Amino acid sequence: LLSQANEAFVRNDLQVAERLFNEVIKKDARNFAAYETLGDIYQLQGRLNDCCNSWFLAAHLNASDWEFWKIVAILSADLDHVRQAIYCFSRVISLNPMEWESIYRRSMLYKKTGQLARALDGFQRLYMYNPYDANILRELAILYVDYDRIEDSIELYMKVFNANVERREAILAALENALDSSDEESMFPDINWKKIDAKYKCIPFDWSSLNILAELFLKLAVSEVDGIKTIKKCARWIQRRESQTFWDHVPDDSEFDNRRFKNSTFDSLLAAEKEKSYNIPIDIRVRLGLLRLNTDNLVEALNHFQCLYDETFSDVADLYFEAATALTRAEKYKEAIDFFTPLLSLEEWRTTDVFKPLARCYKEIESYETAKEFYELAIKSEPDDLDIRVSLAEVYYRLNDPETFKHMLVDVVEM
């Protein structure tokens, strides 16, 4: 009777006679080739769900054949069948705890679902077994952030930083010893560098990594000074100025600014250490501004923000906003308005997000006449918020027009 399998499968190669497999399955489902082929066939006929189904049940008779369960998993995943994918993957990993694609996708799906721990175990294991992959680091860091565990997330990057430092020092020491020792002779030591490149194979620590680190430091909001110091240090290891230790002992944030010219130890340096990159990317400077703002150091923060004017506006309109908001949150309105106002130039930024805080800023300054405007613009584009109406209502009260104020409140209380 089994022959009917073979007779069919070969003769079903072309067309719908394949759906006569469905007669072969009825007598006994336990045969694999039937389901597997049925899946192979549905995969070809175009219909995906029936296929995925066939493959799933197919998978269940060769339990521990995880190379198949993986396929079922990814297929289920692409079909937006999450729990199926997670389940199949989970078994694939239960059987083979060293399939990183599966663990990755599964952990991503866990991250999606909300089971952050289950994802975190995976990403931990993944990073552990592959510390030279930036995306894994990013994701694991993000997970650590979502877990209110920023410290680990920061240590994660500081490790990479220190690794880069070690690498640099190793290279320099190597070529130094080689060069100096050689120069005593005429030749040059046959020294191995692949050993150097391997033994010190860190993830490259560039400005992006530092920006991420900065963001992580902002998200921390605890002992921001140490953060700023670290940012400056790493930013100073970049630009190859780590030799300059004294910058660690100045709070002025004098470096990365012209003020450095007024420093005593600086002027004493050789022009070789000078003429080096002292300028940082704006993406980081702003964050230093914010991190400075966190410490009620408005002066430096503003000195950092003031560098936004020099940059081409459109390329950093996103940062003006952040800078503007942080100032409102910092009860610094007179300064916030200066960074809110330029956004009005671009149409895309004419939204409530910019109109509320502006209005509040002008409200708090006791220049209500101009706050009224933006509150009206905020409500206009677009309705509605209770609090905004109440704010505008403040404006009307403090404008000695409580009648209107009240009528507004009573107008909005209804809906």
Numbering used by the authors: 131 to 316, 337 to 565
Reported in the publication:
Recruitment of Pol III to these genes requires the essential transcription factors TFIIIB and TFIIIC2. The six subunits of yeast TFIIIC are partitioned into two DNA-binding subcomplexes (τA and τB). The binding of these intragenic promoters by TFIIIC permits the assembly of TFIIIB, upstream of the transcription start site, which subsequently leads to the recruitment of Pol III, the formation of a PIC and finally to transcription. A genetic study suggests that the two largest TFIIIC subunits, τ138 and τ131, are responsible for connecting τA and τB16.
Given that our crosslinking data implicated the TPR array of τ131 in connecting τA and τB, and the reported importance of this region for TFIIIB assembly, we determined the crystal structure of the TPR array (residues 123–566) in two different space groups (P62 and P43). We were able to collect diffraction data up to 3.15 Å (P62) and 3.4 Å (P43) resolution. The lower-resolution structure was solved by multiple isomorphous replacement with anomalous signal (MIRAS), using anomalous signal from crystals prepared with selenomethionine substituted proteins or native crystals soaked with p-chloromercuribenzensulfonic acid to final Rwork/Rfree values of 20.9%/24.5% The higher-resolution structure was solved using selenomethionine substituted protein in single anomalous dispersion (SAD) experiments and subsequently refined to Rwork/Rfree values of 25.0%/28.7%. The structure reveals the presence of 10 TPR repeats, while only nine TPR repeats had been predicted. Rather than forming an extended super-helix, the TPR array is instead separated into two ‘arms' by a central region that contains an extended helix and a disordered coil we call ‘ring' domain. This insertion causes a bend in the TPR array, positioning the TPRs of the right arm closer to the TPRs of the left arm. A superimposition of the two crystal forms and an analysis of temperature factors reveal flexibility at TPRs 1–3, 8–10 and residues at the extremes of the extended helix. Surface analysis of the TPR array shows that the inner groove is lined with patches of conserved, often acidic surface residues that may bind to the predicted basic surface residues of τ138. To our knowledge, this is the first time that a loss of interaction by both of these mutations has been probed directly using purified proteins. These results suggest that the binding hotspot for τ138 thus overlaps with that of a binding site for Bdp1.
